[PDB]
Every structure is written in structure tokens, then in C-alpha cells.
Symmetry: C3
Subunit: 544 residues, 3 copies
């Protein structure tokens, strides 16, 4: 038969207590007056001199009656002002033992804790702002990501990160651009008292309903940025970071989210980016690969110029597409939603977005607002224009006259009602003539078969000057053209306007085709000066 | 020291006397039970304190398991009710800022107000054998407080049932109170409930939840998954996302419902099948787009519509309802999308696959398959059963249909284009007498306002209004251009009845007046009602 | 006040221990020398003869001091080489008691354990590769899915599956293609030592941050396949399986993911498919319904021919669309991303993809690379071509001359600059003429109203032979046509080229309209031989 040896109230009373093999004792709390970290202990004479402070304490082996490793069982004193060394022993023990770590009371740390690989740490606190919290009492990262991949694989479940002094510290920081790789942030809250929510090189990390800056334990006057992932081009780039139902509120730095090194695949599913006060943009990134917003909100950012601003050199890499798929955007920014610093890229898709604008939709690298050349598609969008808002030629539900996209190429199309006046159209300007001189207008060729015999119709509108206006001398010519080898065939079907050259400014010309298949215009009568032609082709001929 | 002893109930602990530091083991909160048990240390400073959970006449709960359980708050498994125990549990867990765990199935006849920051979880089985909470009265299991007082919560793996089918609900709002910033992780909603959730949801995500698959007791009145009623302007149901959720066997007027122009309700890979709703699957007075990104909408043969939008478009509206890659095997009986407002919402069907016993959309005026409501229709496959119809909407098996109503591009290269009404204008009711002149269209430069225009016009004039078999017809080819007040028109050619041999012949000579109007003058005996159709080319447009 | 009776060190010491009603004992571990499976026990004389091995042991009732059911409390011996019978009792106990099961130490099994319905089993191990593991010491499935729906409803949280011998065993297998239905795989890791990660018929299963084949405990030379779900057509189909942020690396079988029976709705949100060595494709499936990739990576698979290859008979079912929405694709395969076995289907959408190609974009069932007829849409894509890469006529950001899609039909459209030369175009070949003979070219009719009076202009380009080339005899004709009942009206507005028939090879013709509304050409002069016509219509007339 075996009886209970006794009960102890602290770890100091356990190490000084002597026993024999098989004896079991009850410890009520790691420290006196506490109930946390307590556990049953069985004595082992083989390890009587072993005392690591957690599992074995001078022969007393932890029995894990609760089946869970807690930070209190590693020396975390709730009455103490600091728990840094206790947390370090907790991460080292939980990872070396290959078991999850549980934070059972709010910790306060003044020294960083390096993130050991495969760390799974969870909190048993309340919901959202009353979750199990870890506060940084100094201007130091709560966790330090190791260099290279030494911190790869981790799990952070329902933990809150605060700072004792507003505008200091961060939850994570990387040494030598170390990778915070293959991690999960489940319902983690990042208090606005932090200077940076996450200042580590993130890769392959998913965020499940995290919160950045909604709640604020102490006032932050320096600034708050949600994420800053800085890496190295080619070897350590911030990649594959997805956000589900996350919230980004009350930012005060130059941007809320930032990453460089042409990091790839940052996407936001049903996220909420509102009530920020960023000075430049909500997302400032030197990135490649597309960036997509699948549902969510981008609103209430009246003082932020841009929603997203891409940087870098397009020769090295670029974002091809930024898609806003069904985003509620009630005043998302103040200047333009998408700001480009490279030419042409990125393109934008606004699919079913809804809200009111005090800004432009996009801005090119040269400052052109609402550049349709940057609009890959714009369908089913509803935008009301407030003071400062503009859409330009971009199509909306209330502005059907705009364009859905810049260009589309199809191999076939059936359009019932088509409106296109510059169809097979070519413009040639600065056609300077003297009396009776000849000037080439365009080159004729078969549009499908190279070097083949062409044949079609030409509508030429010649005017005096460069661009037509009210009272501009005009003339129209209808020409049938075709070729058989060196033989050129042109027939003027008709004409109208000032076609006789009664004055120098009259666009009067006779048409021919030379040996180079060039449509040549010869001045008629007194015609002389600078003219401009516009050719509209039909059939098996093109004017280039 | 030594262990003081073992007790079998809470009443045995409070009647037990002790001194400071003494530790006792309680085996269960009530006699004959092994739940709610914990170690207790005596504290003479709190000898008169007895809240029933943490301190019991000086005995402080030691949390040997490290978790707060509803059984440790007075929940008696042998008792028929646990209402007062649950209220004390949520109040204790929230005030202590720690998670609450439901360790056995609860039965409640009085509501429990949702305290803020409540994290409550269950340790039961999977799906239908999860930790369950049954309402033994027609009352909400949880009551959301008014305003934002219930904001922040977490519900993990909890099933909600009703002792009587067709009664009670898991959640209800006081004065349209906000159920804000919550998460429903693998929560099951039994069909015995009258409503799965009858609260004003906002900023809530649903992770693999189930609505109405399982049924504990027969419900003859009806089951609705979600009904969120709010207040316009101040409390609107917004930002509610559903991932991999299941909605089966609904029997009310709809399965999902929200009003007040609530925004951003999206469904990722959800399953809406086997329902028996009388009106629609989703009946909502909503604004902002609504999206279905993957999933199923099928087996709803008795449900008229899949989604039906309501409200006034002047206040707000849904701009787009996108069905992105949805498997739709008989999703409804009349039309997938039913509109109450004109024009809005537009619809996108991207890669959908299934069989139709209904139309695709129905406008506010009842027009089935109104292509004006189709923002895009690409890569869809729909098999037509009895009652199914697609109209002019394009499918993989019906390429003759249209992908969309309209698209505007600044540039385009189309290899093979089919467009006969290109730069086309029709003018009817052109009544002529012998030699009279009637304007047909206004000419202008199509890109530069007021500039000199110049191009060609193809005019097809007919007798009457609309062409038919044997209709007198005539075609004219005209070159036009202008220089200030000077108008230049040249008839390149003509064909047909162009001489006016009879009154019904569409014979006209063409001119341009000072108002830049293309004027037709009757030729010969031409008199009566005629109609023209103009096709322009070049720097001229007929308006 | 009753005192604690004593302390026990094993389950065998409890069953041999006698007691009276109400007495409580403490067991330190289920087996001697162990601290797991321990719990408090209270004696019940009514159940003195009951001994199920977990809850009641010869009258001693388990008190659940920790409040959690563990596999160690069901007979799992850490010192034993096998835990199969203990695991089987654990699933039977946890499901019959309707409470979650916890694996507190790594298990090793040589016999399968059938999946009881509603099983919720979790692990308390580390993160990712150091998670709580279950190893199969034989060529057997770790879990066996029951036939039909008998295993429906389950939850697997943070568990890892390994094999003692590389290339053997699997985590799941189905009896009679039984349904692994309504399950969740949360952060589960599948070691590459397995022959198959999952070889069961999956349906209504979601995968949350799972890993397939990144880590390899022991060397696998036979092969590793991530998922293979084989079902029955009509009755047992693998449906409704969604993957969020999952990783698929280093496959060595014929494919990485496989399912048949025209299973529906397999989607991949922000998944990672890279560094595989698959022999045929990454995804080989006989599937129906669309397949979508919303963000993620498909790269570094230089030895894999295809990314996805659909099979089956389109009469039974087919995939209508395979969408790659914003996918990073740096060398995703070696021949073609999409391989079709059926005609026409599936269609492909590449929306904002970014990467480098050593392959084609698609390959049809007849082997045609980059068949534009299979491209439903291709917008904002950036693809750099390496050796073996090709896009054909598919449009990219750097190759704007390509097509975004094969065809689009709109009821209305406003295009500022339209380039379309085969507009309202018809070609008729093999027009064989003798001296003065007549041959029909096309049928004329109203394009909107059936049988109504048509009226418009026709541009006809007649050539000698069939297809135009350099030096081909050509002639152009401009015709105004209209009809009034049996009366046909045609007027040659003009002509150009070899229109007089001076030689036999000249395309010289006179145009008329017969009673069948056919545009008839009559040879002029000496014209005789093989000719071809191309007609371009305008107005209320069409040439068919
Ligand atoms: Cl499109
Ligand atoms: Cl079993
Ligand atoms: Na990567
Ligand atoms: Na007509």
C-alpha cells in the first residue's frame, strides 16, 4: 500500500523536501500563496541530484496531472514584475519536449525570448481584448525570430501583445532578416500601444481573425504599424502571407502593412481596413505577384492618401494585378486607391465594389488620375462622388459612358449594337504640300496574309492643319484599292467637300499607290500647306 | 503538511471548518458526481466569503485542471435545469478573463445574457455529438445585450437544441443589440430550434458550422438558420463571412435573412441544399455586393428563388451578386436571382455547373433571364429540365447567347466580328407629302464636339415602320462632310425603288440643312409613312 | 471528514485493490513508472464486477480530475512497441461517451483502427513537424473509414502521420469506398514516409493549414501521393473538399492529388504546390464541376508534365472551368499547365498569374498547345518564357498582341479603337467558272428579321485560286443590294483590278441576284478556272 506523502505550497519547499522512491506529493502552486504551476510529483532516487526547475526538482518528477505544460510551471511568478527568464525556460522546455505551451496568466517581460522552432503556444484568456496577454515592459521585441530558418514552424493561438510604454517594443522582430516561417496566428490581438505589431520577416503565415490596433492599453504617441516584413532579395523574401477576417484600425505610421524584397502572395479575405490615419498609404510594398482583396472593407481613411502603393523596379519584378473583389469602400482614401510608381504596372480590377469616393480610383506613375490603361476590368461597381472624388472615364453603374477596361482581344465576337467610329482607323499628320507635290499617307497591305494581294475600300478624310475643329476645311474620298504584284489598282468611287483646290487651305488631293504600296496624295490646284488625313479601311486591306 | 481530506459536494465544503493553508480534495460539485471537482486551500481572511465558485467559506479553488468549467459553477448533471449555473459561469469567466468550458450537456429554461469578451467552448464529440445546450422553453439560449455591450465573444464547438420543436433560438438581441466580433467554430444548430440565430450579427465569422442538418425533436412550425434584424444607420448587420458552412432542410419563408441594408455577407465553399423554403433561400434588404466563392446551391426543388433582394435603391442596393464556381443541381424553381429593385443587382455566373428547373434571373418587372441584369456569364454549364430556361444568356452548350449586356473598351482587336447594327440609327414615323422634306438624323463629329465631320452614310429607307416580306425598300450611299455653314453631300449610289413610281416607294433625295440634319425629300409620287436606318463610317455620327 | 485512501502506480494495482463505497484513490499513471493516464478514482460497490479498463475498473470509477479523455488512460503504454488495441478502445470510448479524445504521446500501431462516427481526436504536440504523431509500423491504414456513411462526422486536430517503413501504410483508407464525410483536418502533417497521405473517399472535408510531404521521417523510395480519393459514380463521389493554406511538396508518384467518379467542388485557397517530382501531373482527376485556385503557388515542378489533367467522358460529366486566380507560377510543369482529355472542356481562366514558363499554357485533347478555344479568359497575366515555354496566341502583359479569350458576345458595346478586318465576312471557295458561266457566291437575307426585305452594301474581293498570296490576280467590287419580294435590286457602285477578263486567270465577274436571293457571279470575257470570293457586308444584309 502507498499513501500520500504530504502537500507543499511552493517550489522552494519541494527542492528542500526529501523523499524515497515512489512517494507522491501535492504541490499547490510554483510559488507560495499561488495556485498556478501546481502539480503532483513522484520521487526518483536515480535523479535525486537533478533539478531543472520544471520537470525534475531534486528527484521530484513532474507528473502532469493536468496533462498540460504551463508557463507557471516554469517559474512564472504572478506577483513578480517580470517573467522573461520564466518564458525563456518555457519555450525551451515545451519545444525540447515536443508539446504545446499554455500561458495561464498575463505575462510581463523586459527581455526578449528567441522563438525556438516548432513552438506551439496558446492562451486560455477571454475573447479578443480580454485574451491572454503578454506585455513588453521595455523597448524590445517580445519574441525574437532566429536567423535563417531556425525559427521555422510555430503556432500562436489566442494571445494578445501589449507594451507598457506606448510607441515601444513589438511582438516579433527578426535577427539578420530571419524567417518567421510556417506559422499560424489564431485570433491574436495586437495592441495599439506597440510600435510595430509584427516587425519580422513573415513567410508562409496565415492569420485567422487577428486584430491590429483596435484596442489600446496605453497611449501611443510615436506611431503604430501593423506589419513590417523586411527581407533580402533572392534569398529571404516575405512570401505567402494570407489574412482571413483580420481587422486593421487606427494606424498612425507611414503605412499599416509593409514588405519589401519583391515578396509574393499577400492576400486578404474579408479583411477590415478602416479608421486608419496613415500618412502615405495603407499598404506600401515593394512586391511582385498579384495582391487580391476577396471581400471586406476599406473605408474611413479620410487622411490617408492611398490605399495601396507599389514600389520597386519593374525590370526586377512587379505586381501584375491588384484585384478588389467585392470590397465595401466608403471613403477608402483621399487621393487615389491605387498608386503606381512603375509605368503600366500594376493593373487594377474593381469587381462589384461599393461605396463613396473622396479620391480618384487610380494614379499612374506619371500622376495621371484614373488612367484607364491601368484598369484591367471595372464591372458592377457603384461609386458616389463626394468632394475630391473622381472616376474619369472608368465605368460605374451610374456612369455607363465609361470604359470597363482599356482593351480586349477576342478571336470572335457577336455584338448586336456596336459603337466604334475609329474602326480600322489610321491618322497621319504633318502632311506638308507644295503646289502639285505628292506626300505618302499610309502603307497598304493584306491584314491577314503577309505579302499577299490586298483588296478593299478606303475612306479618307483630309483636313487643313492637324486636328479638326469648327470651320476646318474638310474633304472625304472613297477609294477602292487592290494590287496584283507590282500592279497597283485604285479607283475613286466618290468625293465630297473642298476637292478642287480653289484655295491653298483646301484639302484637295488625287490618290495613287506607288511601287512601295504607299497611299500617295497629290495636291490639286492651289492646295499647299500642312494637312492631316484619317483613313478608314474595309475588307482585305490595312493602312499602317 | 498533509492532505486534510476529501469532500463529495459543495455543501460538504462550506460546512467543513479549517485553518490557513489546509488543502482538501473535492470530488465533484454535487454528491454522486465527478464534475466540478477541484482542490481547495483554506484562507481565514475570506472565511465569510462564499460566491459558490472561487471561494467557498474560505476554501479557494486551486484550478488543478487549469480550466473553468460550468459544472464548477453549480451545474448539476442530475438537475433538470442549469440556467442559474450558466449565468454565474459566463459572469465568472468574463470577470476572471479566462475561457469557459462546457463539460456536460446543459438544459436551460431562462435566457443567459451574453457578457462581453466571453470565450465559451465545448469538449464534446464531432458535429452532431458535440457539447450541446438545450432550451427547455421558448426563449433564446443567449441574449445579446443592447448596443455594443455584448461585443467580443468566441463560441467553439457548441450545439444548440430545443426541447420542443419549433421554439427558442440560440441568440436574440435586446433592442437590436449587436452580436459583434464573434467567431462560431464548428457550432451546430439543431432543426428543433425555431431560429438558429435571431440576433443582429456584425463582424462574425463562421467556421464549418452546420444549420439544420440534424434534428433532435420534430419541428412542424419551421426552422430558419439566420435572421438578423437591425436599425438603419446605427446598427446594421455587416461583415458576416461563412466558411464551409452547411444549410439544409429549411422550412420557413427563407433560410438566411437580414435587413437595414446590411453589407458584406459572403459565403466561401458553403453548402445550401435540400431546403424546403417557401419564398427564397436568402431574402435580404441589403447593400454592398454578395458573393458565393465555390460551394453548392442544389436540391431546393420547392424553393422559388435562391436569393431575393429588397429595399429602395435610392437608400442602398447590392451592386453585384457573384456566383463564382457554384455547383447548382436544381437550385430553385422559378429563378436563381430575384430582383425587387430595377436594374440592381447585376449578376455574375462564373464557371457554374448544374441542371436548371428554373430561370437564371428575374427582373423587378418579372422578366425572366433579363440579359440587362447579367454583368458576366462565362464558362457556365446548365442542363435544362422541365421549367428551366436561360433565354439569351450564354452557356457552354448555348454559344449563341450573350456573355453580358454591354462592355465598353478603349481599344479592341477582334478577328471575326459579327455586328450588323454598327454605328446604327433608326428613325420612324417619317410622314411625307409629294416633294416634302423630313429630317432623318443629326450629323456631327463623333469624337470632337462641333468639329467638321466627314464620312459615309448607308441609308435603307422602307415603307412603313418595320421591314417584312415584300416591303418596299431602297438603299442610298452618301458621302458627307461640312466646313462651317457649308454642307457637302454626294450620293455615291442607290438601289431599289428610288424613282417614286408609286406613292409607297421609299424614293428620296438627300441633303444637309443649316442645323446639320440629314434631310430626305420625297421623289416623284412618294408620300406616306416611311422609316430610315443609317449606318455611318468615318468621322461622322447619326444621332 | 474522510481522508484520501492512498496512491496507486498502475492500472493493474487498482483492479487488485479492494475498497468500500465513497473511498477515493489517486492513480499515478495507467502503467507503473509512467505519469500519463493517471486520475483519481472513487469506489462504487454497485459496479464492483464491472471493469471496462477506462472509466470503471472493478468498482473504481474514473473521476476525470483533468477533465480530458486521453489515449494513455485507455491502455496506451509508452514503453510498449504497439498501441493499436489501446487506440481502438480510445475511439470506442470517446465516441460512446461523446467527448473529445486527446493523444498525449506519440503512438505506434501495426493494426488499423476503424473510424467511429463523430470522433473528435486532438494532439498536444509541438508545431508542424514536431506535432503529436501516429506511426504505422506495418503496411496498414492508420484509420479505416467504415462503409457507407458509418464514419461520417469527425475532427482531426494537429496530428501527424508517419510510417516506420518508407513507402508503406496510409493515414486513412476506405472500406467499400466508405465516405470520410464531414471532417476537418486542422494543421495535420502527412509525413513523406507514407505511401499515400490519404487513401480514403473524402467528402465535405476542409483542410486548415495541412502539410503533405514536406517532412520525411524515414526514406521513401517507392513513392508518396498526398491524396487519392476513389469513389463510385452516382452513389459515392468525392465532393466538397476545400483546402486553405495547405502545402504539397516533393511528390514522387504519378500524381500528387487524385480523385475520380466525377467528384465535384475541389478548391484550393492560397495553397502551395511546389518542389514535386510527379510523373504525369500534379492533379489527375476524373472530375466534374469547376476547379479553382484562389491565390497560392504552383512552381518548381520541372519534371512534372502537367499541373492538372482532367479525364473521363464529357457525356457523363465534365469540369466547365479551371480558374487560376492570382497564382504564382514559376515553372509549374514541363509540357502544359492544363491538359485536356475531353474535347472543348475544361475551359481555363488565368487571372493575374505571375511566373516563368518552361511549358505551354494548355494542351487540348488532340495535343494542340495553347489552344485559344480553351481560354475562357486571360487577363493581367505575366509569363516569362524560358526554354520550352510557349503561350501561342494567348495574351500576356508583355505580349499584348495575343487574345484575352476566344469569343465574347455582348448586346451592346462602345469601342473607341476597333481593329477587325473580317467584320461581317464570308468566304466562298471552289468557285469554278467556264467562259460566261454563273456560280453562286452567297445567300442574301435580312440579319435581324427573318424573310424581311434586306438592304445594304457588299464588298467583294475575288481572286484566282483559293487563298491570296504574292502576285495573286485580284479584283474588288462594291455592290448596293436590296430586295422587294421577288424583285432583286443590285447596283455596282465601283470596281478595281482585273475586272475585264483579258485573261482566263483574271477574277472578272458581273454580279446579280437570282430568285433564291443568291449573289451570283457571271464570268466576264475569257475568265475561267478556280476562283474564291470574300464578302464584307454592311447594313440590313448578311452573306451566308
Ligand atoms: Cl471580362
Ligand atoms: Cl473502432
Ligand atoms: Na514560397
Ligand atoms: Na430593316
Amino acid at each position: 500500500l502507498m499513501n500520500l506523502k504530504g502537500v507543499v505550497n511552493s517550489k522552494v519547499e519541494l527542492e528542500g523536501l526529501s523523499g524515497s522512491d515512489g512517494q507522491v506529493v501535492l504541490m499547490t502552486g510554483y510559488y507560495a500563496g499561488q495556485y498556478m504551476g501546481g502539480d503532483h510529483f513522484k520521487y526518483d532516487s536515480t535523479q535525486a541530484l537533478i533539478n531543472n526547475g520544471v520537470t525534475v526538482i531534486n528527484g521530484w518528477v513532474k507528473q502532469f496531472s493536468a496533462g498540460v505544460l504551463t508557463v507557471s510551471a516554469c517559474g512564472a511568478d504572478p506577483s513578480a514584475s517580470d517573467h522573461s527568464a520564466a518564458l525563456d525556460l518555457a519555450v525551451n522546455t515545451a519545444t525540447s519536449l515536443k508539446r504545446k505551451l499554455v500561458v495561464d496568466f498575463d505575462l510581463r517581460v523586459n527581455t526578449t525570448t528567441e522563438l525556438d522552432a516548432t513552438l506551439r503556444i496558446e492562451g486560455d484568456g477571454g475573447a479578443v481584448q480580454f485574451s491572454r496577454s503578454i506585455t513588453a515592459t521595455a523597448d524590445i521585441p517580445i519574441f525574437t525570430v532566429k536567423a535563417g530558418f531556425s525559427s521555422e514552424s510555430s503556432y500562436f493561438g489566442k494571445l494578445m501583445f501589449k507594451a507598457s510604454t506606448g510607441g515601444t517594443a513589438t511582438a516579433f522582430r527578426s535577427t539578420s532578416n530571419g524567417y518567421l516561417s510556417q506559422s499560424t496566428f489564431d485570433h491574436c490581438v495586437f495592441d495599439r500601444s506597440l510600435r510595430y505589431g509584427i516587425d519580422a520577416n513573415l513567410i508562409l503565415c496565415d492569420f485567422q481573425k487577428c486584430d491590429f490596433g483596435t484596442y489600446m492599453s496605453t497611449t501611443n504617441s510615436i506611431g503604430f504599424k501593423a506589419i513590417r516584413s523586411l527581407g533580402v532579395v533572392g534569398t529571404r523574401e516575405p512570401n505567402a502571407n494570407t489574412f482571413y477576417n483580420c481587422i486593421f484600425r487606427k494606424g498612425t505610421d507611414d503605412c499599416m502593412i509593409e514588405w519589401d524584397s519583391y515578396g509574393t502572395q499577400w492576400h486578404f479575405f474579408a479583411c477590415d481596413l478602416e479608421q486608419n490615419l496613415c500618412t502615405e498609404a495603407l499598404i506600401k510594398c515593394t512586391a511582385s505577384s498579384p495582391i487580391m482583396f476577396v471581400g471586406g472593407y476599406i473605408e474611413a481613411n479620410t487622411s490617408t492618401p492611398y490605399v495601396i502603393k507599389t514600389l520597386g523596379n519593374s525590370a526586377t519584378g512587379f505586381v501584375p494585378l491588384i484585384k478588389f473583389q467585392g470590397i465595401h469602400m466608403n471613403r477608402p482614401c483621399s487621393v487615389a486607391i491605387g498608386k503606381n510608381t512603375m509605368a503600366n504596372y500594376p493593373k487594377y480590377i474593381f469587381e462589384g465594389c461599393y461605396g463613396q469616393l473622396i479620391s480618384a480610383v487610380v494614379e499612374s506613375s506619371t500622376g495621371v488620375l484614373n488612367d484607364v490603361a491601368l484598369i484591367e476590368n471595372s464591372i458592377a461597381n457603384h461609386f458616389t462622388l463626394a468632394t475630391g472624388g473622381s472616376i474619369g472615364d472608368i465605368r460605374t453603374l451610374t456612369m455607363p459612358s465609361g470604359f470597363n477596361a482599356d482593351s480586349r482581344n477576342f478571336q470572335a465576337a457577336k455584338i448586336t449594337n456596336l459603337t466604334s467610329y475609329k474602326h480600322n482607323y489610321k491618322k497621319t499628320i504633318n502632311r506638308d504640300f507644295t503646289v502639285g507635290s505628292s506626300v505618302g499617307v499610309a502603307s497598304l497591305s493584306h491584314p491577314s496574309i503577309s505579302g499577299a494581294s490586298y483588296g478593299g475600300r478606303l475612306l479618307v478624310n483630309a483636313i487643313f492643319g492637324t486636328t479638326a475643329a469648327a470651320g476646318t476645311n474638310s474633304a472625304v474620298y472613297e477609294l477602292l484599292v487592290t494590287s496584283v504584284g507590282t500592279a497597283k489598282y485604285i479607283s475613286q468611287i466618290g468625293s465630297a467637300g473642298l476637292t478642287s483646290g480653289a484655295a491653298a487651305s483646301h484639302p484637295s488631293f488625287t490618290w495613287s499607290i506607288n511601287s512601295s504600296n504607299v497611299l500617295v496624295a497629290t495636291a490639286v490646284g492651289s492646295t499647299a500647306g500642312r494637312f492631316a488625313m484619317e483613313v478608314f479601311t474595309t475588307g482585305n486591306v490595312q493602312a499602317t
